């Protein structure tokens, strides 16, 4: 009865846990992820925020923008930077820093990121996969360009698995056999 999303006004079942909904930390009601205009990636990131960051429904939101929104936006950018920073500061990625938007090197991903061009985890991952994959395709008969390539790759996949557990770098369309 009282089980209806305030935004779309439609009913929801107390038992369908396959639904993508958030619970307001104030009144405990549920709201559809899609009704707050959130992509599945956003929903996953939210399901990852600290227990300290509660989702809050519109009417329970006192000051706008709702804090969960700014926190969400910051979380994605900070997490992306967290990963890139590690890639940049590694001794195994030195050869992918500079080529010698579709960035052909890490310094390029770096600029594309600082300018706020990444709005999803998928685009960021794909740009990096392409760079790593390009290096793998051209590291003919040579290690540390073959060896390093695989440890920046393993490094990338693992680093991403840590920050974005719900995301699959392995499935990227840009990997080659």
């Amino acid at each position: 009865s009282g089980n209806f999303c305030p935004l779309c006004d439609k009913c929801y079942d107390d038992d369908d846990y396959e639904s993508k909904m958030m619970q307001c930390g104030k009144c405990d009601r549920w709201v559809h992820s899609k009704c707050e205009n959130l992509s599945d990636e956003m929903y996953e990131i939210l399901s990852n925020l600290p227990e300290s960051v509660a989702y809050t429904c519109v009417n329970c939101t006192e000051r706008h923008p709702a804090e969960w929104r700014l926190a969400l936006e910051k979380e994605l950018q900070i997490s992306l930077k967290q990963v890139l920073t590690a890639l940049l500061n590694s001794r195994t990625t030195s050869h992918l820093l500079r080529y010698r938007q579709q960035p052909l090197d890490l310094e390029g991903v770096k600029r594309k990121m600082d300018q706020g061009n990444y709005t999803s985890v998928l685009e960021f991952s794909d740009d990096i996969v392409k760079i790593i994959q390009a290096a793998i395709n051209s590291d003919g008969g040579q290690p540390e360009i073959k060896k390093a390539n695989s440890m920046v790759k393993s490094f990338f996949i693992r680093q991403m698995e840590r920050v974005f557990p719900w995301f699959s770098v392995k499935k990227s369309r840009f990997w080659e056999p």
């Binding site: 846990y17 639904s19 993508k20 958030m22 930390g25 399901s47 989702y55 969960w68």
Partner: peptide
């Protein structure tokens, strides 16, 4: 943030 997933 609590979700159906968490």
């Amino acid at each position: 943030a609590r979700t159906k997933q968490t």
